[PDB]
């Protein structure tokens, strides 16, 4: 199930995020019209594989910015939980300061809209979605919980979609 | 469709063109006990798909080392698949294959895996990693213009196998 379909508008959302400046902020996917978006879910805060993924995307956010691409992470934890994790230094097992926003999905409706809810557990799988600058979903990636994602592979995909966007442009 | 992470991957029985060039009816369940990479491509005689098919075929031994069977699939007929296999690579053909290519002419396999492009009766570039028990572990779906990476697929297969395992010495 879910409503994430290739070639269709990616499901919009409006949710509280912890922004890179460390403050909250209600943001919507539609805020990022005109930019590509990498939108990725992770199961929950304060775990072992997820911080390595989050820090990798945050550390390399400049490479996405050079592609006019916004990276957004998300999980079902509360926005206070996200902020606590950001405020915990990397040296102590936290995220430390972030270059990307982290969305809170406490009612699980965004995870359900993207088809990545592990219903038996109330957490999301490791879903990653590439959305173009028109808001159209271009790529779906979902990993079972034990195996993380690759920033290199994500950049390869974003670059490839932008390259092919140039043949016979819809106008 | 019915492809859900953590659930049995949808079975199928379909005619494939096999590496030896002959047609055989195969099923996903034929490969229980091994990991499976099952990937869809839109149509034969296209220009992005042959790069992927040839790469998976060329590197099939790297999947064999991981006890992993690679299977490709498209809605085109198995006769079309073999015609492309038999076309010289010099003329844009696939050349001899190390992997089977499944034919999905009824579109039911693509629908079961949730990768049918409904307005155009062909599959998106869906790729599915299925473990040795038949459970779906990974979903990858690309829009038509953008191909997949064998390196990334190998990384994922190996990582699922490692985490499946973890002597307490
Ligand atoms: C190409 C197309 C457009 C829509 C469409 O359906 C189609 O098939 C093609 C090939 C758009 C996206 C529509 C908006 C355009 C034309 C935009 C707008 C404007 C004001 N021109 C028009 O709206 N033309 C309409 C109405 C007179 C028409 O009937 O042709 C100025 C041109 C401009 C800015 C640029 C192109 C496009 C974005 C466009 C192109």
Coordinates of C-alpha atoms and ligand atoms in Angstrom, one line a residue:
Chain A
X1 CA 0.0 0.0 0.0
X2 CA 0.9 3.7 0.3
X3 CA 0.5 6.4 -2.3
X4 CA 4.2 6.8 -3.4
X5 CA 4.0 6.0 -7.1
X6 CA 6.8 6.5 -9.7
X7 CA 5.8 9.3 -12.1
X8 CA 3.1 10.7 -9.8
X9 CA 3.4 13.6 -7.4
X10 CA 5.2 12.5 -4.3
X11 CA 2.7 12.5 -1.3
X12 CA 2.9 15.9 0.4
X13 CA 3.4 16.2 4.1
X14 CA 3.5 18.9 6.7
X15 CA 5.4 18.1 9.9
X16 CA 7.6 19.5 12.6
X17 CA 11.3 19.2 11.8
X18 CA 14.5 20.0 13.7
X19 CA 16.2 22.3 11.3
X20 CA 20.0 22.6 10.8
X21 CA 20.1 25.7 13.1
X22 CA 18.9 23.4 15.9
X23 CA 15.4 24.9 16.2
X24 CA 12.1 23.3 15.2
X25 CA 10.0 24.4 12.2
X26 CA 6.9 23.1 10.5
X27 CA 7.9 22.3 6.9
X28 CA 6.2 20.8 3.9
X29 CA 7.6 18.8 1.0
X30 CA 5.9 21.4 -1.3
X31 CA 8.3 24.0 0.3
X32 CA 11.0 22.5 -1.9
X33 CA 9.4 22.9 -5.3
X34 CA 12.1 23.8 -7.7
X35 CA 14.7 21.6 -6.1
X36 CA 15.2 17.9 -6.2
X37 CA 14.6 16.2 -2.9
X38 CA 16.1 13.1 -1.2
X39 CA 13.5 12.1 1.5
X40 CA 14.7 9.2 3.7
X41 CA 13.1 7.4 6.7
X42 CA 14.9 5.7 9.5
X43 CA 13.3 3.5 12.1
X44 CA 13.8 5.4 15.3
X45 CA 16.2 7.6 17.2
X46 CA 19.1 6.6 19.4
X47 CA 19.9 3.4 17.5
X48 CA 23.1 2.0 16.0
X49 CA 22.8 2.0 12.2
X50 CA 20.6 5.0 11.7
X51 CA 23.1 7.6 13.1
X52 CA 25.8 6.5 10.7
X53 CA 23.4 7.1 7.8
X54 CA 22.1 10.4 9.1
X55 CA 25.6 11.7 9.8
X56 CA 26.8 10.6 6.4
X57 CA 24.0 12.5 4.6
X58 CA 24.5 15.5 6.8
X59 CA 28.3 15.5 6.4
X60 CA 27.9 15.4 2.6
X61 CA 24.9 17.7 2.3
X62 CA 27.1 20.2 0.2
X63 CA 27.3 17.6 -2.5
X64 CA 23.6 17.5 -2.7
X65 CA 23.3 21.3 -2.6
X66 CA 25.6 21.6 -5.6
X67 CA 23.0 19.4 -7.4
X68 CA 20.2 21.8 -6.3
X69 CA 18.9 18.9 -4.1
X70 CA 17.5 19.1 -0.6
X71 CA 18.1 16.1 1.8
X72 CA 15.4 15.5 4.4
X73 CA 15.4 12.7 7.0
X74 CA 12.4 11.5 9.0
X75 CA 11.3 9.0 11.7
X76 CA 8.3 8.4 13.9
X77 CA 10.0 9.8 16.9
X78 CA 8.9 13.1 18.5
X79 CA 10.6 16.3 17.5
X80 CA 11.9 16.6 21.1
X81 CA 13.6 13.2 20.6
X82 CA 15.3 14.5 17.4
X83 CA 16.5 17.6 19.2
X84 CA 17.9 15.5 22.1
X85 CA 19.8 13.4 19.6
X86 CA 21.2 16.4 17.8
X87 CA 22.2 18.0 21.1
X88 CA 24.2 14.9 22.1
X89 CA 27.7 15.1 20.7
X90 CA 28.9 12.6 18.2
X91 CA 31.7 11.8 20.7
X92 CA 29.0 10.5 23.1
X93 CA 27.0 8.6 20.5
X94 CA 24.7 11.4 19.3
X95 CA 24.2 13.0 16.0
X96 CA 25.8 16.4 16.8
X97 CA 25.0 19.4 14.7
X98 CA 23.1 18.6 11.4
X99 CA 23.2 20.1 7.9
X100 CA 19.8 18.6 7.0
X101 CA 16.3 18.8 8.6
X102 CA 14.9 15.8 10.6
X103 CA 11.2 15.4 10.3
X104 CA 9.0 14.0 13.1
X105 CA 6.2 11.7 12.0
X106 CA 4.6 10.8 15.4
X107 CA 1.2 9.8 13.9
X108 CA 2.8 7.6 11.4
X109 CA 0.8 9.1 8.5
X110 CA 3.8 10.1 6.4
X111 CA 5.4 6.7 6.7
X112 CA 2.1 5.2 5.8
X113 CA 1.7 7.5 2.8
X114 CA 5.2 6.4 1.5
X115 CA 4.4 2.8 2.1
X116 CA 7.3 2.2 4.5
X117 CA 5.4 1.5 7.8
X118 CA 6.4 -1.7 9.5
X119 CA 2.9 -2.1 10.8
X120 CA 3.6 -4.7 13.5
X121 CA 6.1 -2.4 15.2
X122 CA 5.0 1.2 14.6
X123 CA 8.3 2.1 12.9
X124 CA 9.4 2.8 9.4
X125 CA 11.6 0.6 7.2
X126 CA 14.7 2.3 5.7
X127 CA 12.9 4.0 2.9
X128 CA 14.5 6.6 0.6
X129 CA 12.7 8.5 -2.1
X130 CA 14.0 10.8 -4.9
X131 CA 11.6 13.5 -5.9
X132 CA 12.3 15.9 -8.8
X133 CA 12.0 19.7 -8.9
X134 CA 8.4 19.3 -10.1
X135 CA 7.5 17.2 -7.1
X136 CA 7.3 14.0 -9.1
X137 CA 8.5 10.8 -7.5
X138 CA 11.4 9.3 -9.5
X139 CA 12.9 6.6 -7.3
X140 CA 11.9 4.3 -4.5
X141 CA 14.4 2.5 -2.2
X142 CA 13.3 0.4 0.8
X143 CA 15.7 -1.6 2.9
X144 CA 14.8 -4.0 5.7
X145 CA 16.0 -2.7 9.0
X146 CA 19.5 -4.3 9.3
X147 CA 21.1 -2.8 6.2
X148 CA 21.9 0.9 5.6
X149 CA 22.0 3.1 2.5
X150 CA 24.8 4.6 0.5
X151 CA 25.3 8.3 0.0
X152 CA 27.4 7.5 -3.1
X153 CA 24.5 5.5 -4.7
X154 CA 22.0 8.3 -3.8
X155 CA 24.2 10.9 -5.5
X156 CA 24.6 8.7 -8.5
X157 CA 20.8 8.5 -8.9
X158 CA 20.2 12.2 -8.4
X159 CA 22.9 13.0 -11.0
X160 CA 21.4 10.4 -13.4
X161 CA 17.9 11.8 -13.1
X162 CA 19.1 15.3 -13.7
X163 CA 21.1 14.2 -16.7
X164 CA 18.2 12.4 -18.3
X165 CA 15.9 15.4 -17.5
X166 CA 17.7 17.1 -20.4
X167 CA 16.7 14.8 -23.3
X168 CA 13.5 16.0 -24.9
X169 CA 12.6 18.1 -21.9
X170 CA 8.8 18.0 -21.4
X171 CA 9.0 21.7 -22.6
Chain B
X1 CA 1.2 -5.2 -5.5
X2 CA 2.1 -7.9 -3.0
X3 CA 5.8 -7.2 -2.6
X4 CA 6.2 -6.3 1.1
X5 CA 9.5 -6.2 3.0
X6 CA 9.6 -9.1 5.5
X7 CA 6.9 -11.1 3.7
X8 CA 7.4 -13.9 1.2
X9 CA 8.2 -12.5 -2.2
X10 CA 5.4 -13.2 -4.7
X11 CA 6.0 -16.5 -6.5
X12 CA 5.8 -16.6 -10.3
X13 CA 6.1 -19.3 -13.0
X14 CA 7.1 -18.0 -16.4
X15 CA 9.0 -18.9 -19.5
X16 CA 12.6 -17.7 -19.5
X17 CA 15.3 -17.8 -22.0
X18 CA 18.1 -19.6 -20.2
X19 CA 21.9 -19.1 -20.5
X20 CA 22.2 -22.0 -22.9
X21 CA 19.7 -20.2 -25.3
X22 CA 16.8 -22.6 -24.7
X23 CA 13.4 -21.8 -23.2
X24 CA 12.5 -23.1 -19.8
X25 CA 9.6 -22.5 -17.5
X26 CA 11.0 -21.4 -14.2
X27 CA 9.6 -20.3 -10.8
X28 CA 11.0 -18.1 -8.0
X29 CA 10.5 -21.1 -5.7
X30 CA 13.0 -23.0 -7.8
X31 CA 15.7 -20.9 -6.1
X32 CA 14.8 -21.4 -2.4
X33 CA 17.9 -21.9 -0.4
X34 CA 19.8 -19.1 -2.3
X35 CA 19.5 -15.4 -2.4
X36 CA 17.8 -14.0 -5.5
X37 CA 18.1 -10.7 -7.2
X38 CA 15.0 -10.3 -9.4
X39 CA 15.1 -7.3 -11.7
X40 CA 12.6 -5.9 -14.2
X41 CA 13.4 -3.9 -17.3
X42 CA 10.9 -2.2 -19.6
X43 CA 11.4 -3.6 -23.1
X44 CA 13.8 -5.5 -25.3
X45 CA 15.9 -3.6 -27.9
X46 CA 16.1 -0.4 -25.8
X47 CA 19.2 1.6 -24.9
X48 CA 19.4 1.8 -21.1
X49 CA 18.4 -1.8 -20.4
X50 CA 21.2 -3.5 -22.3
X51 CA 23.9 -1.8 -20.1
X52 CA 22.2 -3.3 -17.0
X53 CA 21.5 -6.7 -18.4
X54 CA 25.0 -7.1 -19.8
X55 CA 26.5 -5.9 -16.5
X56 CA 24.5 -8.3 -14.4
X57 CA 25.3 -11.1 -16.9
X58 CA 29.1 -10.2 -17.1
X59 CA 29.4 -10.2 -13.3
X60 CA 27.2 -13.2 -12.6
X61 CA 30.1 -15.0 -11.0
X62 CA 30.3 -12.3 -8.3
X63 CA 26.7 -13.2 -7.4
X64 CA 27.5 -16.9 -7.6
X65 CA 30.2 -16.4 -5.0
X66 CA 27.5 -14.9 -2.8
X67 CA 25.2 -17.9 -3.4
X68 CA 22.9 -15.5 -5.2
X69 CA 20.9 -16.1 -8.4
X70 CA 20.2 -13.1 -10.7
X71 CA 17.0 -13.2 -12.8
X72 CA 15.9 -10.5 -15.3
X73 CA 12.4 -10.0 -16.5
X74 CA 10.4 -7.9 -19.0
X75 CA 6.9 -8.0 -20.5
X76 CA 8.3 -8.8 -23.9
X77 CA 8.0 -12.3 -25.2
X78 CA 10.6 -14.9 -24.6
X79 CA 11.1 -15.0 -28.4
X80 CA 12.0 -11.3 -28.3
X81 CA 14.4 -12.0 -25.5
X82 CA 16.2 -14.7 -27.5
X83 CA 16.3 -12.5 -30.6
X84 CA 18.1 -9.8 -28.6
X85 CA 20.5 -12.4 -27.1
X86 CA 21.2 -13.8 -30.6
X87 CA 21.8 -10.3 -32.0
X88 CA 25.6 -9.7 -32.2
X89 CA 26.8 -7.3 -29.5
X90 CA 28.5 -5.4 -32.4
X91 CA 25.0 -4.6 -33.7
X92 CA 23.5 -3.6 -30.3
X93 CA 22.6 -7.1 -29.1
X94 CA 23.0 -8.6 -25.7
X95 CA 25.2 -11.5 -26.7
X96 CA 25.4 -14.7 -24.7
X97 CA 23.9 -14.5 -21.3
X98 CA 24.9 -15.9 -17.9
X99 CA 21.5 -15.2 -16.3
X100 CA 17.9 -16.2 -17.3
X101 CA 15.5 -13.6 -18.7
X102 CA 11.9 -14.1 -17.8
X103 CA 9.0 -13.1 -20.0
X104 CA 5.9 -11.5 -18.4
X105 CA 3.5 -11.1 -21.3
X106 CA 0.4 -11.1 -19.1
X107 CA 1.9 -8.3 -17.0
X108 CA 0.8 -10.2 -13.8
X109 CA 4.3 -10.6 -12.4
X110 CA 5.0 -6.9 -12.7
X111 CA 1.6 -6.2 -11.1
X112 CA 2.4 -8.6 -8.2
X113 CA 5.7 -6.8 -7.6
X114 CA 4.0 -3.3 -7.8
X115 CA 6.2 -2.1 -10.7
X116 CA 3.8 -2.0 -13.6
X117 CA 3.6 1.4 -15.3
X118 CA -0.1 1.2 -15.7
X119 CA -0.6 3.7 -18.5
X120 CA 2.0 2.0 -20.7
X121 CA 1.8 -1.8 -19.8
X122 CA 5.5 -2.1 -19.2
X123 CA 7.5 -2.4 -16.0
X124 CA 9.5 0.3 -14.2
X125 CA 13.1 -0.6 -13.4
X126 CA 12.2 -2.6 -10.3
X127 CA 14.9 -4.7 -8.5
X128 CA 14.1 -7.0 -5.6
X129 CA 16.5 -8.8 -3.2
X130 CA 15.0 -12.0 -1.8
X131 CA 16.7 -14.1 0.8
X132 CA 17.3 -17.9 0.8
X133 CA 14.0 -18.4 2.7
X134 CA 12.1 -16.5 0.1
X135 CA 11.5 -13.4 2.2
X136 CA 11.7 -10.0 0.5
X137 CA 14.5 -7.9 1.9
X138 CA 15.0 -4.9 -0.4
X139 CA 12.9 -2.9 -3.0
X140 CA 14.5 -0.7 -5.6
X141 CA 12.3 1.0 -8.3
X142 CA 13.7 3.5 -10.8
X143 CA 11.8 5.5 -13.3
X144 CA 12.4 4.4 -16.9
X145 CA 15.4 6.7 -17.8
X146 CA 17.9 5.7 -15.0
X147 CA 19.7 2.4 -14.7
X148 CA 20.8 0.4 -11.7
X149 CA 24.3 -0.4 -10.3
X150 CA 25.7 -3.9 -10.0
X151 CA 28.1 -2.6 -7.3
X152 CA 25.2 -1.3 -5.2
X153 CA 23.3 -4.6 -5.7
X154 CA 26.3 -6.6 -4.6
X155 CA 26.8 -4.4 -1.5
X156 CA 23.2 -5.0 -0.5
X157 CA 23.2 -8.7 -1.0
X158 CA 26.4 -9.2 1.0
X159 CA 25.1 -6.9 3.8
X160 CA 21.9 -8.8 4.1
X161 CA 23.8 -12.1 4.3
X162 CA 26.2 -10.7 7.0
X163 CA 23.4 -9.4 9.1
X164 CA 21.5 -12.7 8.7
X165 CA 24.5 -14.3 10.5
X166 CA 25.1 -11.7 13.2
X167 CA 30.8 -18.9 17.1
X168 CA 31.0 -17.0 20.4
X169 CA 34.8 -17.3 20.7
Ligands
LIG1 C1 5.0 23.3 -23.3 C2 3.9 22.8 -23.1 C3 3.1 23.3 -21.9 C4 1.9 22.6 -21.7 C5 1.5 21.5 -22.6 O1 0.4 21.0 -22.4 C6 2.3 21.1 -23.6 O2 1.8 20.0 -24.4 C7 3.4 21.6 -23.8 C8 4.1 21.0 -25.0 C9 3.6 24.5 -21.1 C10 4.0 23.8 -19.7 C11 2.5 25.5 -20.8 C12 3.0 26.9 -20.2 C13 4.0 27.4 -21.2 C14 3.4 27.5 -22.6 C15 4.4 28.9 -20.7 C16 3.2 29.8 -20.7 C17 2.8 30.9 -21.7 C18 1.9 31.9 -21.1 N1 2.2 30.3 -22.9 C19 0.9 29.6 -22.9 O3 0.3 29.4 -21.9 N2 0.4 29.1 -24.2 C20 -0.8 28.4 -24.2 C21 -1.9 29.4 -24.1 C22 -1.8 30.4 -25.2 C23 -0.9 27.7 -25.5 O4 -2.0 27.3 -25.9 O5 0.1 27.5 -26.2 C24 4.2 31.6 -22.2 C25 5.2 30.4 -22.6 C26 5.6 29.5 -21.4 C27 6.2 30.5 -20.4 C28 6.7 28.6 -21.8 C29 6.3 27.2 -22.3 C30 5.2 26.5 -21.3 C31 6.0 26.4 -19.9 C32 4.8 25.2 -21.7 C33 5.5 24.6 -22.7

